[PDB]
């Protein structure tokens, strides 16, 4: 496994009070997959920063690991986090390939 | 059942809903205690949102639909949601 790129973005929730993203889950039979950025909407904290992009894998939010987390939990946790005031730090990977197994694996085809 | 829900938004500044996009339309994910939608009671998870204040979502991406919804909730005044019971 190697990373194409890993970035850490601190969002000022004081200047933009909502994140402005959707999340998408991928998983296969084998437990591979994760939580990924779906849409990024203009006007939100994530769009203003400009660095996170659709298809990036969410690795961590604040101090919480998102790499082995059900969709239900990912959605609930992100809301708990947005709900309370204060900064939000998102760590994401830029993925080589958008398949469940593909974020940290170079395409072979 | 297509239902029209008028929320006067006098006592609530938010709908108290989450949205789910399907690749096609936007649907109710969950309804939160303390929002206008729960106070009304008629909308359920999995209902499809068709229009808000005469604006039709059929003509926009799911994420643009959510942006417009957010903008209309932000504007003071009553909200009318048109939903398809699923």
């Amino acid at each position: 496994a190697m990373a194409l790129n890993i970035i850490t973005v601190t969002l000022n929730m004081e200047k933009y009070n909502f994140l402005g993203i959707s999340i998408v889950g991928q998983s296969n039979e084998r437990g591979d997959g994760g939580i990924y950025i779906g849409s990024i909407m203009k006007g939100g904290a994530v769009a203003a920063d400009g660095r996170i992009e659709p298809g990036d894998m969410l690795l961590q939010v604040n101090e919480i690991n998102f790499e082995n987390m059900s969709n239900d939990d990912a959605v609930r946790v992100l809301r708990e986090i947005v709900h309370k005031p204060g900064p939000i730090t998102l760590t994401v990977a830029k993925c080589w390939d958008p398949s469940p197994r593909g974020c940290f694996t170079l395409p072979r085809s | 059942n297509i239902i029209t829900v008028t929320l006067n938004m006098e006592k609530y500044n938010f709908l108290g809903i989450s949205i789910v996009g399907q690749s096609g339309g936007i649907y109710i994910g969950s309804i939160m205690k303390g929002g206008a939608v729960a106070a009304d009671g008629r909308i359920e998870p999995g209902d499809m949102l068709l229009q808000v204040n005469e604006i039709n979502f059929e003509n926009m991406s799911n994420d643009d639909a959510v942006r417009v919804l957010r903008e209309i909730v932000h504007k003071p005044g009553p909200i009318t949601l048109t939903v398809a019971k699923c």
């Binding site: 939100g44 | 994910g29 994420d63």
Partner: peptide
């Protein structure tokens, strides 16, 4: 299916 994070 995409799950919008911000509550409306």
């Amino acid at each position: 299916s995409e799950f919008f994070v911000d509550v409306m």
